[PDB]
Design a protein around this ligand. Structure first.
Ligand code: CLA
Ligand code: CLA
Ligand code: CLA
Ligand code: CLA
Ligand code: CLA
Ligand code: CLA
Ligand code: CLA
Ligand code: CLA
Ligand SMILES: CCCCCCCCCCCCCCCC(=O)OC[C@H](COP(=O)(O)OC[C@@H](O)CO)OC(=O)CCCCCCCCCCCCCCC
Ligand SMILES: CC1=C(/C=C/C(C)=C\C=C\C(C)=C\C=C\C=C(C)\C=C\C=C(C)/C=C/C2=C(C)C(=O)CCC2(C)C)C(C)(C)CCC1
Ligand code: SF4
Ligand code: SF4
Ligand code: SF4
Lengths: 80, 141, 39, 730, 75, 37, 75, 31, 52, 138
């Protein structure tokens, strides 16, 4: 299972969740930005690691980070 | 001293081959002019001119005159490309001036590049040639 | 006509203008003064 | 679920075939095993050292055993210039009657392989003359491998497991390796040379049965203990001495003669014995420098902390706490120092051979130079690769604050861009002058070539004594203070440097100038990938958190413009091609220059190496002729295995292009059709895989394609190097 | 036509079939695959879908044309 | 395949043992080891 | 006339028209895949030849994968 | 001159001593 | 096994290295006998792995 | 999980042996009209009027359909439920987890993966060499 970490530089423009193809990410309430929301990763067991969230992140450097960890059936994306 | 080399006027392998030099251009005596010009060089065992680049002024035309002629022109190309790039970055749209050349600004810079060594010395003294290293975008180490 | 001048002032056209002029210098120097290995 | 691999819980529950592949490649990365402590890291490393040492001893024993058993060593020493040395016997049931008759060579009664490692010249020079001595050496090295295999098991036992402070004792290890492993072993080797090798060179059999009875010198050890050391140099071997006999032999055990023995065309064994004894005294003195347990000596931390100036800030502060804590710094220092000296072994054994009649065995000196340069090419790249592993893992910016390591990171943009400058400055011109020389030779005007005499390196040949170039400087000038000092090397050195029948200081021309600049382009650009691999290992502007991802990771995704080959492992991977390309350039230069030197046609190299077509035609096309006719429709010869290996290495090198050009998710989607095909095929779907078939990972086939590239590079050239040299001289 | 003409024609039959294999798989799996099921939204000419699922390097239909050009050169 | 060296019967049996019997045992034992629970 | 004895012309005309034809075949696999990404509408493609080609891609490719391995081993 | 049959066979019996000690080291390093 | 063993001597009988000696059928048998021995070892190692 | 399957002629891209051994994935949505949708396993199928039940091999294939069901139709299907189906009969309901689509912020959702520091404020690997933990873990 990979690790998806969300850092405090989040602006809450929800682009990582919309770029997510595996329903890993969701928006939770937060107080550290103007949009008052931070990305969260409650479902990293379904994380394939394809880093579409990191492409969609507009902040510098990144507010979301995917670290490729142990490979399972779900993370290797196998239909077999 | 180059005892392993010989002058091409006294090199016997050059002398048997300079009489068969091919004409490179439309002049029918191009190879004979090349036979006279290459005779003053230093030739090896098979009569080809071996250039000497160590710094001797006897062989200054081998490397030093090509060095002075290159570094003047290459310093000219580098300076007028640098001076154009500084001039266009103060405009409203500095990006379009590189893909669409401001040609009268380019000719004005290029003709002024004949005094690039006195200009590069002056910009080095003024500090505008070299930027401070703490004022530069830097990698996160 | 003004936009044709901008097309002639594009980076592809002007580098083809410069390299033709540069090759124009070097060919015409090596045609009247060929075979210069040294000075 | 699976117990393989036992050192990684992240890999143990991998359901795919990636578990098997990554279990192999993470096996020796002991730092990242689960539950690994610091002291058990060093203890597993220490026993792995003992296992590796005994594999070296078993490899030398197998070399010694097969020469004694299936070789012609006693037949070879009676005519070393004519008899081909036999490596071992061929036993291949695939051989037809053509290949049996082709490989029944070197006076043997069976198909054999000709030795090109040079061990015959090595064994004959160090006194071995019988197959019984080589057999006794092989059995002893079996016993010596047993004493090191048992010691690794013993030092893994909890009674004899060494503590972490013992592994951190740098002063005790440096004192014992210099005075002992470097010093006593060089003193013992000088002891072997004066007792065994020098008398066996002079026709006197000295063995274990009689070395206590006869002395190496008639004067004994009394001139050693009384300070009259010149007795051991009196009466040397003259120029008419024949190796292995007493005719023309002297009595001196330690001479200082300089150049070469005349018949063997190698160094005098008395010079070799005197060299080893002299460096043994210096190494034993050097192994008394550091403070271990008696107060006197140096503290390495104290030297590094004191060595600081105004231009480097903190200087070498806390480098002792950096090197002694980082195994990758120690490994990268060790691989670089071995990488320098293995190149130095290559550049000195061809120019100063030491083994008898090895300067006439041309295929051996070809194979010896190329092997040591290719090993040194590996050791240099892995030194910088482990320099990058140190920066990813073991580097602390807090403890190394403002020292010489952090200031390399601080100006790393100036380091990489100037290495980028030197590579471009060299490569625009070295390629620029070759392509000029190719075109003007093609256009019928080879006198229009830009040919530069390498005056600066010809001058150094003059300052060592070569008066061929007419420079009167230092040793070429007989009237200088360096020439007139009365050095005893000088009559022997000046004779060897001016004979021209050796490879000591070869005459260099414009072809030699141009290919050293390709070599300089090759060394700088390979370094440029490697320093940039080392200093962008922690991070860069495209990937600041690269140290979080580790050393060897695939990428950072296609976002931020794309991040292919962004890891520091990938700059190891890119520099491997450049190292092979550099080693391709220098070994082509070594082989073609020596092919003209050995054949006498030095004008073949000197007038065709200035342009790349002469490299292509007179070297690659011309010398491959007897290679590719190793087999043909009209039969075979002894170059049939090299012809097959030449085409084998072409196949392995081209197969690596598949893993480097075609990439993963093409093949993963291809396997998914193959997986579907197996699942829906009756009588075959009853057979099911336990590990799911997946494509090789992104890092993996970059390694696998590189391994095919490197194995394909080496087996191609070693076939071409040997068959062109043994087809011409062997 | 002899034995050498038999062998080289089957080489030609082999290398055309691989060039047919790479290009037809690039047409059929242009929209989707078991690896990346939404390649139609990613486009015709995209690099990948990241290092995930083991690595989805060169999954696009452009990259089969990229690999088919080598095999056309080889054929 | 012949041999004038002593113990020429030893490459008669060691070549098909190192060639066949050593990999079929080792890769046999490795296949059980790397695929066991 | 006199083409067949000019061995240069016979070798060059075969080779140039081989290479032109091979390049255009690879472009068929290109614009086949560009159609599938861009212009393939599944609403008007139900149970026709193109929909059914997409419905047995693993049948087509894996047999094409097999015949490439067969031909590569047997040529 | 040449080695004997009993010399080659003795070397193989001696070679069982590194064969057994490498087996002990390999199983110790695996632990 | 009877089906697979029966045709397996065929390739080495007619195309093997012993096909032009007096031991053509012997060398075809030993080729297929040693193939079945690897084949039953491939079965039994599979069954130890797959069903454990 | 009730629902008639969509009218599909069959494909080779669908369920392999993983579906009846490890897990499979079911997507359930309600359609207003009988419409044509592109199957994520290759081919085109027809939505039934009312509830549809489609079993897919991967969670990505269900979400590639759910992305298509939400943006490639003139009435948007924004009620699709995605399940994980096990061979033992137990069904784990996956998407959307709280009944609200995850791009919209919902209360009662707890933050996972948040670290309350920057990505450049991660600790060095030298400080954690033999703890076994990554710089993003501890
Ligand atoms: C790589 C080493 C090196 C370098 C950096 C130089 C550099 C130079 N050489 Mg030099 N040279 C060298 C070694 C070197 N050489 C060697 C080994 C030889 C062969 C004996 C010579 C032979 C040589 C002569 C004889 C002369 C130079 C001179 C020069 C100077 C060029 C003129 C100048 O300054 O105008 C830009 C410059 C200092 C000239 C000079 O000014 O002398 C001081 C001069 O006449 N060189
Ligand atoms: C006129 C602008 C200019 C100048 C003054 C610089 C200056 C620098 N370059 Mg260069 N460079 C430029 C153009 C320029 N470059 C462009 C266009 C590119 C893309 C090809 C690069 C790519 C580049 C590389 C890859 C490298 C350098 C490096 C360097 C340094 C070494 C000098 C050198 O010859 O490098 C060699 C430069 C080249 C081979 C490229 C030159 C390209 C042309 C010939 C320059 C002029 C083109 C421009 C259109 C002129 C505009 C005219 C104006 C009137 C419109 C120096 C700091 C090196 C470095 O960092 O070392 C410290 C290095 O590694 N540069
Ligand atoms: C690194 C760049 C390099 C250098 C230092 C030179 C330098 C030179 N070239 Mg050149 N050459 C180059 C690259 C180089 N070339 C390349 C790569 C090619 C192949 C396209 C050529 C092909 C070439 C030809 C065919 C000729 C020159 C000639 C010459 C001379 C130019 C005389 C002049 O214009 O005044 C001078 C010796 C001319 C000459 O005088 O020959 C000596 C000439 O005939 N060059
Ligand atoms: C005098 C005492 C002594 C000696 C003889 C050594 C010797 C050894 N120790 Mg040790 N050590 C000592 C005490 C000693 N130790 C002390 C007290 C410490 C504790 C602080 C250690 C702690 C220590 C550790 C932690 C380890 C070693 C290791 C080693 C081995 C080095 C690897 C090897 O094969 O070397 C071979 C080296 C040589 C033959 C000489 C150097 C060769 C260089 C590269 C150049 C020679 C060039 C020359 C031309 C070559 C000729 C070749 C010929 C074919 C032509 C070696 C057997 C390592 C090992 O492998 O453990 C088993 C290991 O990691 N030692
Ligand atoms: C004294 C020599 C020495 C030592 C003991 C190490 C030690 C280490 N190396 Mg290596 N390194 C060296 C030389 C050295 N290396 C050289 C010469 C190279 C250049 C080729 C490098 C470049 C290199 C890289 C770039 C990597 C390491 C890494 C590793 C780790 C083990 C990786 C592994 O499982 O094996 C290697 C595993 C394999 C499966 C390779 C075996 C197959 C090879 C290709 C052929 C062997 C054939 C065999 C004889 C049969 C370990 C810390 C890794 C590391 O620490 O990552 C952070 C890493 O990725 N090394
Ligand atoms: C023959 C093949 C070859 C060539 C010439 C290049 C060229 C170069 N390599 Mg290398 N490279 C190669 C193979 C090659 N490489 C392969 C097989 C690998 C393994 C993947 C790499 C790996 C690699 C890396 C990893 C690095 C290099 C670097 C570079 C530069 C080295 C400096 C130099 O010599 O520049 C001078 C020479 C050239 C640029 C050669 C080209 C000269 C051309 C012919 C003339 C200019 C043409 C002009 C632009 C107009 C073209 C017109 C045309 C469009 C019609 C340069 C771009 C380094 C780099 O870029 O840093 C500086 C770098 O870091 N290369
Ligand atoms: C590591 C050194 C080494 C190498 C590479 C060779 C290579 C060879 N041996 Mg061997 N041999 C060696 C050691 C070596 N031997 C030792 C020291 C002995 C003396 C006991 C023997 C005894 C021997 C016999 C009697 C025979 C061979 C034969 C041969 C050939 C075929 C292989 C075979 O049947 O092996 C059989 C070998 C053995 C049964 C014993 C060898 C035991 C060694 C020490 C194991 C080495 C393991 C190694 C160091 C670990 C690294 C592995 C790594 C790559 C993963 C081949 C030329 C045959 C031959 O001559 O064919 C014509 C043959 O009949 N060898
Ligand atoms: C000479 C180099 C080479 C070789 C050997 C391969 C091999 C392969 N390519 Mg190819 N390929 C290459 C370069 C090469 N490629 C490069 C340069 C590229 C990058 C653009 C690609 C990209 C690529 C693609 C994109 C495709 C292939 C495919 C394939 C396969 C062709 C079908 C097949 O199985 O044939 C049979 C196998 C061979 C002809 C290989 C030689 C086998 C020998 C004769 C067997 C010898 C017996 C064996 C070694 C005994 C074992 C001994 C034991 C000790 C191990 C095969 C695995 C295609 C594929 O997999 O489709 C099925 C595919 O689609 N290739
Ligand atoms: C470098 C070592 C110089 C030694 C040296 O001069 O030291 C001078 C100075 C060291 O002075 P400090 O008093 O700081 O020294 C205290 C030292 O003990 C610690 O370094 O170092 C610098 O100023 C760094 C500049 C290095 C600049 C490097 C120049 C470029 C070198 C690359 C070209 C070399 C390759 C050419 C091969 C022919
Ligand atoms: C009482 C005593 C002293 C007297 C000692 C006397 C009276 C004799 C000493 C003899 C000795 C200590 C001999 C040492 C021999 C060591 C050897 C032989 C080691 C060899 C190691 C290797 C690794 C070689 C491998 C190889 C072999 C096997 C080959 O066959 C060729 C290939 C090669 C690789 C070279 C002294 C005065 C000191 C001081 C006070 C103590
Ligand atoms: S890597 Fe892909 S699946 Fe994982 S969180 Fe990022 S976008 Fe979602
Ligand atoms: S990580 Fe990026 S995409 Fe996700 S909420 Fe923060 S800023 Fe938006
Ligand atoms: S390695 Fe492949 S998947 Fe990863 S970023 Fe590069 S192209 Fe994309």
């Amino acid at each position: 299972s990979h690790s998806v970490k969300i850092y405090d530089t989040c602006i809450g423009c929800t682009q990582c969740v919309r770029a997510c193809p595996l329903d890993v990410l969701e928006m939770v309430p937060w107080d550290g930005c103007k949009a008052a929301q931070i990305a969260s990763s409650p479902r990293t067991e379904d994380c394939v690691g394809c880093k579409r969230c990191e492409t969609a992140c507009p902040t510098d450097f990144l507010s979301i980070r995917v670290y490729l960890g142990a490979e399972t059936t779900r993370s290797m994306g196998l239909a077999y | 001293d180059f005892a392993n080399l010989t002058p091409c006027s006294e090199n016997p392998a050059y002398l048997a081959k300079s009489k068969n030099f091919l004409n490179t251009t439309n002049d029918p005596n191009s190879g004979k002019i090349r036979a006279e010009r290459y005779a003053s060089a230093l030739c090896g065992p098979e009569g080809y001119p071996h250039l000497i680049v160590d710094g001797r002024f006897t062989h200054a035309g081998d490397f030093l005159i090509p060095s002075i002629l290159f570094l003047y022109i290459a310093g000219w190309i580098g300076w007028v490309g640098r001076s154009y790039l500084i001039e266009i970055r103060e405009s409203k749209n500095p990006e379009m001036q590189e893909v669409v050349i401001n040609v009268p600004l380019a000719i004005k810079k290029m003709l002024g590049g004949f005094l690039w060594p006195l200009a590069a010395v002056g910009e080095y003294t003024s500090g505008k040639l070299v930027m401070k290293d703490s004022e530069i975008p830097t990698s996160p180490r | 006509m003004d936009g044709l001048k901008s097309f002639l002032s594009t980076a592809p056209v002007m580098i083809m203008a410069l390299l033709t002029f540069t090759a124009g210098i070097l060919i015409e120097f090596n045609r009247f003064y060929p075979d210069l290995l040294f000075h | 679920a699976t117990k393989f691999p036992k050192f990684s819980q992240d890999l143990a529950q991998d359901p795919t075939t990636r578990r098997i592949w990554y279990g192999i490649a993470t096996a020796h990365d002991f730092e990242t095993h689960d539950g690994m402590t610091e002291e058990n890291l060093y203890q597993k490393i220490f026993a792995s050292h003992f296992g590796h040492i005994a594999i070296i001893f078993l490899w030398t024993s197998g070399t010694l055993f097969h020469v004694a058993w299936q070789g012609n060593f006693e037949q070879w020493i009676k005519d070393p210039l004519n008899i081909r040395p036999i490596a071992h016997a061929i036993w291949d049931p695939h051989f037809g009657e053509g290949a049996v008759n082709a490989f029944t060579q070197a006076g043997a009664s069976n198909p054999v392989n000709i030795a090109y490692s040079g061990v015959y010249h090595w064994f004959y020079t160090i006194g071995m003359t019988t197959n019984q001595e080589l057999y006794s050496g092989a059995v002893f090295l079996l016993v010596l491998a047993s004493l090191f295999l048992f010691a690794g098991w013993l030092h893994l036992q909890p009674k004899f497991r060494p503590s972490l402070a013992w592994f951190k004792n740098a002063e005790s290890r440096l004192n014992h390796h210099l005075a002992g492993l470097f010093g006593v072993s060089s003193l013992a080797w000088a002891g072997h040379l004066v007792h065994v090798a020098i008398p066996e060179a002079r026709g006197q059999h000295v063995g274990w049965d009689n070395f206590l009875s006869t002395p190496p010198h008639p004067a004994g050890l009394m001139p050693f203990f009384t300070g009259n050391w010149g007795v051991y140099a009196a009466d040397p071997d003259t120029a008419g001495h024949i190796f292995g006999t007493s005719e023309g032999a002297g009595t001196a055990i330690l001479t200082f003669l300089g150049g070469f023995h005349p018949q063997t065309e190698s160094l005098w064994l008395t010079d070799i014995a005197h060299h080893h004894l002299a460096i043994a005294v210096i190494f034993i003195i050097a192994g008394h420098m550091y403070r271990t347990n008696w107060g006197i000596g140096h503290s390495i931390k104290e030297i590094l902390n004191a060595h600081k100036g105004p231009l480097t800030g903190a200087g070498h502060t806390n480098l002792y706490d950096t090197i002694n804590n980082s195994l990758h710094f120690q490994l990268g220092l060790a691989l670089a120092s071995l990488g320098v000296i293995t190149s130095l072994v290559a550049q000195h054994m061809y120019s100063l051979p030491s083994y008898a009649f090895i300067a006439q065995d041309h295929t051996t000196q070809a194979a010896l130079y190329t092997h040591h340069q290719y090993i040194a090419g590996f050791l240099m790249v892995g030194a910088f690769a482990h320099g990058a592993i140190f920066f990813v893992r073991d580097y602390d910016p807090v403890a190394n604050k403002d020292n010489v390591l952090a200031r390399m990171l601080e100006h790393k943009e100036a380091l990489i861009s100037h290495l980028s400058w030197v590579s471009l400055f060299l490569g625009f011109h070295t390629l620029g002058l070759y392509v000029h020389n190719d075109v003007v030779v093609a256009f019928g005007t080879p006198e229009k070539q830009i040919l530069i005499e390498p005056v600066f390196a010809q001058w150094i040949q003059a300052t060592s004594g070569k008066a061929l170039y007419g420079f009167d400087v230092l040793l070429s000038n007989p009237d200088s203070i360096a020439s007139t000092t009365g050095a005893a090397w000088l009559p022997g050195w000046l004779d060897a440097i001016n004979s021209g029948t050796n490879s000591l200081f070869l005459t260099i021309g414009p072809g030699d100038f141009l290919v050293h600049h390709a070599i300089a382009l090759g060394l700088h650009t390979t370094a440029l990938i490697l320093i940039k691999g080392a200093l962008d290992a922690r991070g860069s502007k495209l990937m600041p958190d690269k140290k979080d991802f580790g050393y060897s990771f695939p990428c950072d995704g296609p976002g931020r413009g794309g991040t292919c080959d962004i890891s520091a492992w990938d700059a190891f991977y890119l520099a491997m091609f450049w190292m092979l390309n550099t080693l391709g350039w220098l070994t082509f230069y070594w082989h073609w220059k020596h092919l003209g030197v050995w054949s006498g046609n030095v004008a073949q190299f000197n007038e065709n190496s200035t342009y790349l077509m002469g490299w292509f035609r007179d070297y690659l096309w011309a010398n491959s002729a007897q290679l590719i006719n190793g087999y043909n429709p009209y039969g075979v010869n002894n170059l049939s295995v090299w012809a097959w290996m030449f085409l084998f290495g072409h196949l392995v090198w081209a197969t690596g292009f598949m893993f480097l050009i075609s990439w993963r998710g093409y093949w993963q989607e291809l396997i998914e059709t193959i997986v579907w095909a197996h699942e829906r095929t009756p009588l075959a779907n009853l057979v099911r895989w336990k590990d799911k078939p997946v494509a090789l990972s992104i890092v993996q086939a970059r390694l696998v394609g590189l391994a095919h590239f490197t194995v394909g590079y080496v087996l191609t050239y070693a076939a071409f190097l040997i068959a062109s040299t043994a087809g011409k001289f062997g | 036509l002899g034995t050498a003409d038999f062998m080289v024609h089957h080489i030609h039959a082999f290398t055309i079939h691989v060039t047919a294999l790479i290009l037809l798989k690039g047409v059929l799996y242009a929209r989707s695959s078991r690896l990346v099921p939404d390649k139609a939204n990613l486009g015709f000419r995209f690099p990948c879908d990241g290092p995930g699922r083991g690595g989805t390097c060169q999954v696009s239909g452009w990259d089969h044309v990229f690999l088919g050009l080598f095999w056309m050169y080889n054929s | 395949m012949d041999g004038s060296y002593a113990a020429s019967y030893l490459p008669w049996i060691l070549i098909p043992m190192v060639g066949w019997l050593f990999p079929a045992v080792t890769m046999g034992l490795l296949f059980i080891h790397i695929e066991s629970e | 006339p006199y083409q067949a004895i000019d061995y240069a012309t016979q070798l060059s005309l075969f080779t140039h028209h081989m290479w032109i034809g091979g390049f255009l075949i690879v472009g068929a696999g290109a614009h086949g895949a560009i159609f599938m990404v861009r212009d393939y509408d599944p609403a008007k493609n139900v149970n026709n030849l193109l929909d059914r080609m997409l419905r047995h891609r693993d049948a087509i490719i894996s047999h094409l994968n097999w015949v490439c391995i067969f031909l590569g081993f047997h040529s | 001159m040449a080695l004997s049959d009993t010399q080659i066979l003795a070397a193989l019996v001696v070679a069982l001593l590194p064969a057994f000690l490498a087996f002990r080291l390999s199983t110790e390093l695996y632990k | 096994g009877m089906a697979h063993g029966y045709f397996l001597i065929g390739p080495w009988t007619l195309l093997g290295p012993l096909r032009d000696s007096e031991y053509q059928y012997i060398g075809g048998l030993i080729g297929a006998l040693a193939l079945i021995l690897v084949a039953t070892a491939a079965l039994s190692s599979y069954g130890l792995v797959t069903f454990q | 999980l009730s629902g008639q399957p969509p009218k599909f002629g069959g494909s080779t891209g669908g369920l392999l042996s993983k579906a009846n051994r490890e897990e499979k994935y079911a997507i359930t949505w309600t359609s207003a009209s009988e419409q044509v949708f592109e199957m994520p396993t290759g081919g085109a199928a027809i939505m039934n009027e009312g509830e549809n039940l489609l079993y897919l091999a991967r969670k990505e294939q269900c979400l590639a359909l759910g992305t298509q069901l939400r943006t490639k139709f003139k009435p948007k299907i924004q009620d699709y439920k995605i399940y994980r189906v096990y061979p033992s009969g137990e069904v784990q309901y996956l998407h959307p987890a709280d009944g609200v689509f995850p791009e919209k912020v919902n209360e009662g959702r707890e933050a996972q993966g948040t670290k309350t520091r920057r990505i450049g404020q991660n600790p060095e690997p030298v400080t954690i060499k033999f703890s076994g933990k990554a710089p993003y873990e501890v």
